[PDB]
Design a protein around this ligand. Structure first.
Ligand code: ADP
Length: 267
């Protein structure tokens, strides 16, 4: 919900401010126009969804969450209906409240995965809608924020509608620390717990991963409590984490990270 709740992504936040907020707030200062389709790409659970909602919140604009997998329906014309409805709703909401409307589409790549054209005809209908967003005469202000963990699955026709493209990265050593401080903050830690060390040990783990680690480590003492009929749980100690790390790997493999940085190298 807010930007300030999002750990890293200081430069992402700025790119979305610059692509969406400042134009919405001051169109008169953008006499050379600006893109309305913004691609967030990266590994899973690193804040593509959060960052999109956080902007919608920053604007207090309407926010419309769609899963691309859900709109691709195996009947001709239901999918078309879906894609038309989305943008229509967006435009109406924008026009009614006189402020922007943000469509967040996650699993975007799923628009290129086959079901029954037909799926091409839906795709092209979507892209037509995209192309329609900047049209000068429309009083509604609609932005599409598209998200995918497999940007490489997007073809050229589809990529050209997304002119702004931000890489949302794994959390770095410093940021993982903030993440750990943040998640761990609501549970009882042993003094022997060294968050700096754990940040080091969590190289390659996604923000959601980190959350799941903390939960899982909290689970060990809670499990103990109940098993032993105690009133509160034992504190979470440094071992507790090591144990859970022994079995939990990064959600993203060394190849994927290259896939991403390669893809990033273009486009
Ligand atoms: N940068 C971040 N700061 C704080 N929490 C994060 C961050 N990235 C991910 N998370 C956590 O992981 C969950 C999934 O994040 P999400 O925004 O869905 O990213 P993605 O679209 O990449 O899956 C969030 O609900 C949040 O708890």
């Amino acid at each position: 919900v807010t930007l300030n709740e999002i750990v890293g992504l200081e430069d992402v936040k700025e790119a979305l401010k610059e692509a969406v907020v400042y134009p919405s707030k001051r169109p008169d200062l953008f006499p050379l126009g600006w893109p309305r389709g913004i691609l967030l790409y990266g590994p899973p659970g690193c804040g593509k969804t959060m960052i999109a909602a956080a902007v919608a919140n920053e604007l207090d604009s309407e926010f419309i969450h769609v899963d691309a997998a859900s709109i691709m329906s195996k009947w001709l014309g239901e999918a078309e209906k879906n894609v038309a409805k989305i943008f229509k709703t967006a435009r109406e909401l924008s026009k009614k409240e006189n402020k922007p409307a943000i469509i967040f589409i996650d699993e975007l790549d799923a628009l290129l995965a086959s079901y029954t054209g037909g799926e091409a005809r839906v795709r092209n209908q979507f892209l037509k809608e995209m192309d329609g967003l900047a049209d000068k005469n429309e009083i509604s202000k609609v932005y599409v924020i598209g998200a995918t963990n497999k940007p490489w699955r997007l073809d050229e026709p589809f990529l050209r509608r997304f002119q702004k493209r931000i890489y949302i990265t794994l959390p770095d050593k410093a940021h993982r620390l903030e993440l750990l401080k943040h998640y761990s903050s609501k549970v009882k830690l042993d003094p022997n717990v060294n968050l700096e060390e754990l940040a080091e040990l969590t190289d390659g783990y996604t923000a959601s991963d980190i959350r799941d680690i903390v939960q899982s480590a909290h689970m060990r003492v809670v499990k103990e409590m109940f098993e032993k009929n105690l009133q509160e749980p034992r504190a979470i100690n440094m071992d507790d984490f090591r144990e859970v790390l022994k079995v939990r790997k990064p959600s993203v493999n060394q190849d994927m990270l290259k896939a991403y940085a390669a893809w990033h190298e273009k486009f």
